[PDB]
């Protein structure tokens, strides 16, 4: 029935203030389309550190995509993707923050470059992960394949690399044509 969804977006330095913006708007179009439903989101920004931009109970309470992501600030740092996925799995999906135990845990990752650290995401084994590689650093194949590890198998379904950030509007419209 209900699914708890988390937005783990990249706020690295290779993001331009305009590219970052498209990432916040994509998450805003995702919540508008999926509001008026069982779904209930949270958002966490990662680079060197890990900050939860708004948790599950904040959503249920506010509900307006826009008003929730207003005090968001670009970190301009590294892209410690592993530490992010773990932070989300043991610090964000919690019932003190307002996660529903009966919901199926989903995570959408949005990065524009290869991870900056090491380790493993075995803690988020039971968290369906969708990773999305954006552009210009995910061009060769050696890089695109590095995102396979963060996502769920088959990676064929869970990993999505885009040519440009302007292609995020496109991915939106591909989820408006799905089941």
């Amino acid at each position, epitope marked *: 029935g209900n699914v708890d969804l988390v937005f783990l977006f990249d706020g690295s330095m290779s993001l*331009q*203030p*305009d590219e*970052f*913006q498209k990432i*916040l*708007d994509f998450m*805003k179009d995702v919540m508008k389309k999926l509001s008026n439903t069982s779904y209930q989101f949270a958002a966490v920004q990662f680079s060197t550190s890990y900050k939860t931009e708004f948790d599950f109970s904040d959503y249920v309470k506010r509900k*307006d995509p*826009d*008003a929730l992501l*207003k*005090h*968001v*600030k*670009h970190m*301009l740092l590294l892209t410690n993707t592993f530490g992010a996925i773990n932070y989300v799995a043991t610090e964000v999906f919690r019932e003190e923050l307002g996660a529903r135990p009966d919901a199926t845990k989903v995570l959408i990752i949005i990065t524009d470059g290869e991870a900056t650290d090491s380790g493993n995401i075995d803690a988020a084994k039971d968290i369906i992960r969708y990773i999305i590689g954006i552009g210009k650093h995910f061009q060769t194949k050696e890089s695109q394949e590095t995102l396979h590890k963060f996502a769920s198998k088959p990676a064929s379904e869970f990993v999505k690399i885009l040519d440009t950030f302007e292609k995020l509007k496109d991915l939106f419209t591909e989820l408006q044509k799905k089941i």
Partner: antibody
Amino acid sequence: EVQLVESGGGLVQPGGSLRLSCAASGYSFTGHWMNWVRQAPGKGLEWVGMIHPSDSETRYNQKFKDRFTISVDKSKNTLYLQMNSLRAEDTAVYYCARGIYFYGTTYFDYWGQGTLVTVSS
Amino acid sequence: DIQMTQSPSSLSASVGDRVTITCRASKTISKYLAWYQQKPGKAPKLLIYSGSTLQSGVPSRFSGSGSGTDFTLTISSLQPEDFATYYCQQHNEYPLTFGQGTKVEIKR
């Protein structure tokens, strides 16, 4: 094309009021902070305050919190600025500018052409 | 509180010359300082934000740099179009404060 058109200025009697307007076009209004920055004839710039379309969270420069009230109309994508008990010094050009809240505090990247408010009897 | 002082309050430079305006802050403000170009009768145009970064659209000839309390706008290879009053504002704390500007005029 991001566009910030302005209106509402003119001549106003001291101890009077006036509500400016900032009609924005070209981007998703409820996604950016909006500011009001005025400019006294031939002087420096002064920041008045900012509001967020989505819910109207506001932050003012204290100098202007007593008389200046800011609000909005999401329906029309129009930004307003309510000014009360204006005085001779409040004469200036009032611009409205969209702003980036990402780094530090806020820096403005898209300004409006400006509106001349003259306070005299 | 935060007084931004700019220097000089005006200057004339031959087309092509390397101009440098300095804006010093009251109390440090990290690398957060932005620079605007106000053509007569028009609205300020953002140029530089966060100390040295160029806005997309600003010709390369404009350069920023500095940190803490002393920053400087460097117009390398002035032009005839670069005529206007150059403003400086800090964005590290409220209320947002601006400078007093510097009218940069083209000597011919």
